[PDB]
Design a protein around this nucleic acid. Structure first.
Ligand SMILES: CCNC(=O)CCNC(=O)[C@H](O)C(C)(C)COP(=O)(O)OP(=O)(O)OC[C@H]1O[C@@H](n2cnc3c(N)ncnc32)[C@H](O)[C@@H]1OP(=O)(O)O
Ligand SMILES: C[C@H]1O[C@@H](n2cnc3c(N)ncnc32)[C@H](O)[C@@H]1O
Ligand code: MET
Ligand code: SF4
Lengths: 531, 538, 38
RNA sequence: GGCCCCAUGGUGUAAUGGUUAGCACUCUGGACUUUGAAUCCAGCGAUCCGAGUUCAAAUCUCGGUGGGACC
């Protein structure tokens, strides 16, 4: 089923090969004879010996033949002897395969083979990974599907199969397996107690199963498993009895905390008595399980509010920030279940604390002072512009801060509302002229550094950084131009525009040279009166 | 005292690492070593030996995976123990005062304590000297020292040093062998047979012994004698492929006798390792190349084990004066490198190289090469020439992983066969071809028409040896990942049996085995007969 | 493109967190999560 | 209390305004189916900390840390 084009392609393929077709051979090799009906080939090498090989392609072809012809055991044996992946038997046709489980089992009919088949299940499909065609739910699903019918036909002499099948589930359900072992031990053809015991001991590496038995909340199971644990009964037996005597729910909490299952420990101890609740807190404050306990307790509980504030405080060490103080003013998921605590007051939690459950009004103007100082130090300068409106008439200081932050029209609003006209030109006019001058200084520095580093690069990265630094000031310059123009500084602003335009053209023309961000062409920084 | 200070650092490291283990935290040993050394004012790093020397057992159970030293000592798959015999005389000297023209100091050659072909400065030599050549003392000391490095001793094997062993009084060798077996059994005995029966049920699980010899002591009597000891492989010493050289070297025998010794031993079922001796007097370089090629081209020899030892002129021998007279000249080191590189390109795949170069101390040889390492130089040269070798030791999983860190991905079977000493040999293996990495092997043949053991008369095919490489896995342990208990051997046994039943057309399968290993075959329904495990084929 | 909502809602999430519907955060964050895999 | 001086591998040290901090003791690995230790080969170790400046900083500055002698 090939053609001249197909054959020539498979031959050359630009001397690129992949998959089952090719097969590495040795130096000086030759060809002696192919062996059909047995999928072999024999060849001679120069030193004077023979060699017999099984090439993949023939084997896989015959395997597909057999799978279509449904004699499962023949493919099984011919496929295990050659050390080939078993999962392919499912991978070839997962759908139809599942409809013939009992026939497959009758085809195999051997406990060791089924055990070996189980011990190598894997999720991934090698027909898409390892054996390309030349043309979670699955494992548990098939395991239970076959286990049901195989138990139905015989549980007695296939008990170990059931054991392995339940063991090799996605999650280890060791508890039910231990239950089956114990019930067989109680009971007197079928598999015996020590038989399955050894059949699982190597399989489980007992000590973990001993711990699991402790988790299973039954002493008798722990007894049998610990029989083989080699530990001194003088050690654990008094401890085990001590654990047995003490309280049921407290037993649960103590076993979970001994098994690190802190979620179950807290769940048990919550109902084990409110008196132990603070101690629980310590654990969920030591193990940071605040969020978990949030579900255990309910609103309108003092425990609930205490654990909420514990969550917001203890875990937020070095993080007395928006979440901490936020949910403090919230006391958890509740909107406003607490007040009278603010960490830094980032203009929101501060006023939320102050206004909600009003403690001190802005008559106690210390809040305004703190907010102004903090956020102005944070390069905001609008904090004061808002809070001082509620505070004393220090508007002039607000005007000063706006000028420092280049907020011109707000200073104009303050001067024309408070009638502070004397300061209309005393400071702002020279300040903005100096702003234009330092704009020139910075622009010249940018131009010089850009040219220097561009030439240094051209001798044989960071240029784009300076480039992006230059495009940020477009509308800043734009509005500063008109601000100056009210005082009729059109010449200085014209100088500003000319310098900005020259630098813009410099980087614009250098951009194709370098090549890499793209700037925006819809930034307005020019005025007709300026022009 | 600084010593207690390093002890405190050791304890600190111990508590840190056990704490990391409890929560399953992973930590670099060297990092904590450096930090602890600095914080305690140490001028030098701590030795790893002392680090292992203080772990408590309830932690040594699981800390060894991160603590073993020099893993290559088990990178093959089987532990190795070497023992030393008492110094004596070689037999040939019965004619004249000639041991061998190139042999080093013997019993009376200007050495206080020494042995034939041994200066006396090998670590094994000092161990024997302290032990006064006592078997039991030295073997206990050596196994204890090996276990100090946290290495499992589940499976062990013995190699015997010494000049000649077959040529010793019988009672002495019986005493020696029973002492060896009692060393592992721990049971005092009275004869060989009692020790054998007791070591059968021991737990050390000894798997065999190998001895050196020479073709003079190769008649079927000595082979039957060795059958009583469980020996598996043998050493001969070939030194050439040209008869004239033997009398030139005053060897005192014929290459023919070597050939019939090979044939007879292979018929019996032992393994054999040869010794090759490049750069000999009256031998050109082309002579060496031709003879080495012959060594595999001829169906006469086709041996199994190979060992090589370049010529080394040493004071005391006649060759010392011959070179001293300026009449025996060696090669330049480059010549030796090229010779070795060419040789390695010729080894058949089944043959396994065991060692290269001697271990003689440097300041004694009048022509000793500077390099204590030669295999590496040959590897560099064969990279330069872009031609690869196919030795077994260089394609097993252990060495390949430890030197290149390559994981097998697709392992399959491979079958080959040839002719040697009239035998129809056959070689089986599992290996991954794409990386040319090998995991398991088997050597099986048809017995010759002429035989010495009547138990093999008619319908009998002998399986000389079987082995899977890797590292030691305790017989109770099942899967530390790795590849030593996945049932691989079972497939090889059943397939070899099927081949012998059909292709060989035999009627009964026999096999040699180590004393403990017999129990293994009991699991397959094999029963004992004489010193041979056997199964009926019908 | 959507990067505007990358942090805006990621800081406007509080308007929902400050209420009782904290669970709804993830119930919308999924969309903000989705665009992470472009 | 200040003046000075110092801070490089685990330790002993070179080096210095620019693509790489070099040695030394030490430790680790292979040669090795005779060897932890030998012989060779190969490999893993680093500039007290924070601020500055400088295109660029271990070497330029300041601060801190700790240590060293001065009245
Ligand atoms: C003949 C002297 N030479 C030797 O022995 C070379 C060293 N031998 C070995 O390392 C191993 O025996 C082999 C080379 C055979 C690899 O073992 P292999 O993978 O083929 O064993 P399998 O996986 O097929 O079978 C496993 C069984 O072998 C058993 N086994 C392993 N070693 C031995 C031993 N010395 N003696 C008896 N049984 C053994 C195991 O206990 C295991 O039994 P299990 O059912 O409890 O697990
Ligand atoms: C062990 C193998 O090495 C050979 N042999 C022993 N001692 C020497 C030596 N000094 N030089 C060369 N070969 C030697 C033996 O003859 C035997 O073949
Ligand atoms: C140790 S030399 C090799 C073994 C033996 N002495 C022989 O020459 O036959
Ligand atoms: S037979 Fe071997 S051990 Fe004895 S003298 Fe000759 S070379 Fe040396």
């Amino acid at each position: 089923d090939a053609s001249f084009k197909t054959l020539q392609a498979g031959l050359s393929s630009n001397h690129v090969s992949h998959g089952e077709v090719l097969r590495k051979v040795e130096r000086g090799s030759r060809i002696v004879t192919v062996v059909p009906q047995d999928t072999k080939l024999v060849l001679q090498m120069p030193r004077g010996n023979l060699e017999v090989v099984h090439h993949r392609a023939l084997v896989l072809a015959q395997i597909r033949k057999w799978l279509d012809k449904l004699m499962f055991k023949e493919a099984f044996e011919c496929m295990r002897k050659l050390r080939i992946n078993l999962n392919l038997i499912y991978d070839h046709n997962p759908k139809v395969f599942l409809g013939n489980v009992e026939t497959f089992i009758k085809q195999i009919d051997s406990v060791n083979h089924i055990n070996l088949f189980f011990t190598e299940l894997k999720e991934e499909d090698v027909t898409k990974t390892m054996y390309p065609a030349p043309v979670g739910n699955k494992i548990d699903l098939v395991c239970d599907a076959m286990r049901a019918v195989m138990e139905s036909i015989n549980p007695h002499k296939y008990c170990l199969s059931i054991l392995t099948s339940h063991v090799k589930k996605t999650t280890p359900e060791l508890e039910i397996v231990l239950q089956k072992v114990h019930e067989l031990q109680g009971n007197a053809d079928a598999v015996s107690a020590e038989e399955a015991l050894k059949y699982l001991l190597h399989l489980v590496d007992v000590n973990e199963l001993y711990d699991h038995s402790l988790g299973t909340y039954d002493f008798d199971l722990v007894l049998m498993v610990a029989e083989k644990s080699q530990k001194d009964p003088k050690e654990y037996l008094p401890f085990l009895n001590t654990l047995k005597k003490m309280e049921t729910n407290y037993q649960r909490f103590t076993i979970d905390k001994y098994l690190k299952r802190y979620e179950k420990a807290i769940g048990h101890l919550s109902k084990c008595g409110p008196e132990y609740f603070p101690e629980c807190l310590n654990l969920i404050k030591d193990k940071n399980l605040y969020n978990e306990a949030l579900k255990l307790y309910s609103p309108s509980s003092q425990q609930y509010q205490d654990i909420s504030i514990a969550y917001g405080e203890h875990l937020m060490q070095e993080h007395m920030y928006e979440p901490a103080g936020l949910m403090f003013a919230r006391c958890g998921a509740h909107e406003k279940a607490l007040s009278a605590f603010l960490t830094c007051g980032n203009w929101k939690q501060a006023l939320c604390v102050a206004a909600q459950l009003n403690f001190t009004k802005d008559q106690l103007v210390g809040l305004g002072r703190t907010l102004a100082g903090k956020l102005v130090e944070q390069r905001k300068h609008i904090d004061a512009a808002m809070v001082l409106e509620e505070c004393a008439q220090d508007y002039e200081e607000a005007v000063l801060l706006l000028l420092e932050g280049a907020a011109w029209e707000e200073a104009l609003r303050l001067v024309y509302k408070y009638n502070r006209l004397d300061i209309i030109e005393t400071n702002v006019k020279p300040s903005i002229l100096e702003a234009q001058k330092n704009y020139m200084a910075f622009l010249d520095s940018q131009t010089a550094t850009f040219s220097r580093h561009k030439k240094r690069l051209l001798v044989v990265e960071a240029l784009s950084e300076v480039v992006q630094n230059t495009e940020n000031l477009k509308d800043e310059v734009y509005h500063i131009l008109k601000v100056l123009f009210l005082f009729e500084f059109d010449e200085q602003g014209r100088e500003l525009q000319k310098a900005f335009e020259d630098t813009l053209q410099l980087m614009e023309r250098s951009l194709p040279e370098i090549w890499p961000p793209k700037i925006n062409r819809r930034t307005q920084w020019k005025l007709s009166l300026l022009d | 005292s600084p010593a207690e200070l390093m002890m405190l650092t050791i304890g600190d490291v111990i508590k840190q690492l056990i704490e990391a283990h409890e929560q399953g935290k992973d930590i670099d040993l060297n990092k904590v070593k450096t930090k602890t050394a600095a914080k305690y004012g140490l001028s030098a790093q701590p030795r790893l030996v002392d680090i292992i020397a203080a772990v408590p057992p309830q932690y040594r159970k699981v800390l060894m995976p991160k603590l073993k030293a020099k893993p290559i000592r088990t990178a093959s798959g089987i532990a190795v123990v070497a023992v030393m015999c008492k110094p004596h005389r070689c037999p040939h000297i019965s004619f004249t005062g000639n041991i061998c023209v190139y042999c080093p100091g013997g019993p009376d050659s200007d050495f206080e304590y020494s042995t034939q072909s041994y200066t006396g400065y090998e670590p094994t030599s000092m161990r024997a000297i302290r032990a006064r050549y006592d078997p039991f003392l030295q073997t206990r000391h050596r196994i204890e020292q090996l276990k100090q490095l946290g290495h499992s001793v589940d499976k062990v094997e013995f190699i015997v040093m010494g000049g000649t062993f077959m040529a010793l009084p019988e009672e002495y060798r019986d005493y020696f062998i029973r002492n060896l077996h009692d060393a592992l059994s721990g049971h005092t005995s009275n004869n060989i047979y009692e020790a054998v029966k007791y070591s059968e049920r021991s737990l050390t699980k000894c798997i065999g012994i190998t001895i050196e010899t020479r073709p003079d002591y190769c008649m079927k009597r000595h082979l039957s004698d060795m059958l009583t000891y469980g020996c598996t492989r043998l050493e001969i010493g070939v030194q050439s492929v040209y008869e004239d050289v033997a009398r030139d070297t005053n060897r005192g025998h014929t290459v023919k006798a070597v050939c019939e010794s090979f044939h007879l031993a292979k018929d019996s079922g032992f393994k054999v390792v040869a010794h090759m001796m490049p750069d000999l007097p009256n031998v050109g370089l082309e002579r060496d190349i031709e003879q080495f090629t012959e060594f595999f081209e001829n169906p006469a020899f086709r041996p199994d084990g190979l060992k090589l030892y370049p010529t080394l002129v040493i004071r005391g021998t006649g060759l010392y004066e011959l070179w001293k007279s300026g009449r025996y000249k060696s090669y330049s080191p480059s010549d030796l490198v090229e010779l070795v590189a060419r040789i390695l390109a010729l080894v058949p795949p089944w043959t396994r190289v065991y060692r290269v170069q001697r271990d003689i101390p440097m300041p004694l040889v009048s022509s000793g090469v500077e390099h204590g390492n030669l295999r590496e130089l040959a590897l560099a040269r064969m990279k330069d020439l872009g031609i690869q070798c196919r030795d077994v030791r260089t394609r097993e999983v252990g060495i390949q992983e430890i030197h290149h860190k390559v994981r097998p991905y697709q392992v399959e079977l491979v079958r080959r066969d040839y002719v040697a000493n009239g035998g129809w040999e056959t070689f089986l293996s599992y290996e991954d071809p794409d990386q040319d990495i090998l995991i398991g092997l088997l050597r099986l043949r048809k017995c010759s028409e002429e035989t010495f053991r009547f138990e093999l008369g008619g319908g009998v095919s002998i399986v000389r040896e079987l082995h899977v490489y890797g590292s030691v896995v305790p017989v109770s342990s099942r899967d530390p990942t790795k590849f030593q208990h996945q049932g691989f051997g079972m497939l090889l046994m059943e397939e070899a049996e099927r081949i012998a039943r059909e292709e060989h057309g035999s009627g009964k399968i026999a096999v040699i085995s180590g004393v403990g290993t017999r129990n293994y075959y009991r699991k397959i329904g094999y029963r004992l007969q004489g010193p041979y495990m056997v199964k009926m084929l019908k």
